[PDB]
Structure formats: C-alpha cells, structure tokens
C-alpha cells in the first residue's frame, strides 16, 4: 500500500 507508486512519485519521499 506504499507500493503502488514505484516510478517518479516515489522520488518525492
């Protein structure tokens, strides 16, 4: 559920 955004969004955290 913190696994749906791999790809660029992950970058924001």
């Amino acid at each position: 559920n913190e696994s749906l955004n791999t790809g660029w969004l992950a970058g924001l955290f």
Partner: antibody
Amino acid sequence: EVMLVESGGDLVKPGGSLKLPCAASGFTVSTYAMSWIRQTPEKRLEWVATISSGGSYTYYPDNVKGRFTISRDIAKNTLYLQMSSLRSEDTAMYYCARHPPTVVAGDAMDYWGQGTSVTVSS
Amino acid sequence: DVLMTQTPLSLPVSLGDQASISCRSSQSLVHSDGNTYLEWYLQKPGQSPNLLIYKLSNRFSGVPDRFSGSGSGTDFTLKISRVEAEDLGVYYCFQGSHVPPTFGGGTKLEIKR
C-alpha cells in the same frame, strides 16, 4: 464517477491562515496518492504538496515547505491543505488531484477537482 | 528547478489537420531507471487539466487516438492528427524526473475559422 470537490477558498490577509478540504467521491482516498496543485491568475501551474498512497509520506517544494501541511482523513474520505503564513504570491486556484498506481498511468494524475480560489491580499 | 519551455503558446490550425506542440526541457528528463516521466495535459476552457500522455509515449485510458507522445531526452512533441472541436484548450507538458516537478507555460490550441 470519480469526483474531487475542493472547498475552503477565500480572501485572506498576508501572513494569514486557512484550510482547504477536498472531498472525494467515486473512490476511496486511503488507496491513492494525492496532491494539491495550484494555478496562478496568469495560468501558471505549480506544485503544492503530495501525500503517499499509503499516507506515510509527504512532499512540499521549497517555496511552500514548512508553511503548508497536506493531511488526509481516511474516515472522511477527504484530503486537506492547511495553509499558514500566507503570501500574496500564494494567490491562485487550488486544485486537488489523485495519482493512480504506476501500472495504470506512470504516476501521472488522472483526475483533478474543479478548484477553490484563494486570494492573499490586505 | 527544471525549466519546462514549451510555449509557441499558439499554433493556428484548421479542423481535421495536423498539430504539433513542442516542449523543451531544461535538461534530460531520463530517469535514473531509464524512464521518461514526461506528461501531457489538456485544459479545456473553464476546466481542470486532463491527462493525455504519461511516461513520454503512453496514451491514457479513454484518451482518443489522434493523440500521440513522441520525443526523447530534452525535446518532446505531442502530435494531434485530425483536430476536432473538442481539442480546444491549453496543452501543458510536465516533468517528473527532476525533484522540483515543473510544468510548461502551456500552448493554447487555436482553431482556424
């Protein structure tokens, strides 16, 4: 269908404060990554804040960092934007947006609300 | 912050024609994972923007046909073949690669008549 309705916009004095809500219908907030994005009177779109699909992480670009807070209330199925210490440069339309899984739309934003309008002025 | 420079802010184009909006980035938007997080949005008058293309060359659900994302590295092209009344609005390019994510200034699609 999927619908996001921002509210809370208003005129406030510089250095003031206010909270935007954004109410989701059509999907659960607790299962999506969500951002606030603003559009200035001159149509320039700039990033405001983001919350992780699982709700444990937050981002703010440097110009709003430390003054703004994005929160979500999974029970209310509503996204918030607490805005403090406001500057006239913050005057813009505040859109509320969701990001589907990276498998669906390469972390892009599929739905955007209709905006609430904020004016920082004395 | 990566400058997203786009804006011929118009192109004049008659219905049923080609249309090519360009977008140039400050630097290469190729992610450390060999992706291109370049996106295209259309804002129709009095509306929020709508997603058209994500990841450089990927058309979103329901997003027509005549919409196509081409480009690489620093230069990008959204390309509308045909051109319908419904395509009117402002197109933005968008960069997710570099850490303050940035928009273009938008190109308005002007309809000839």
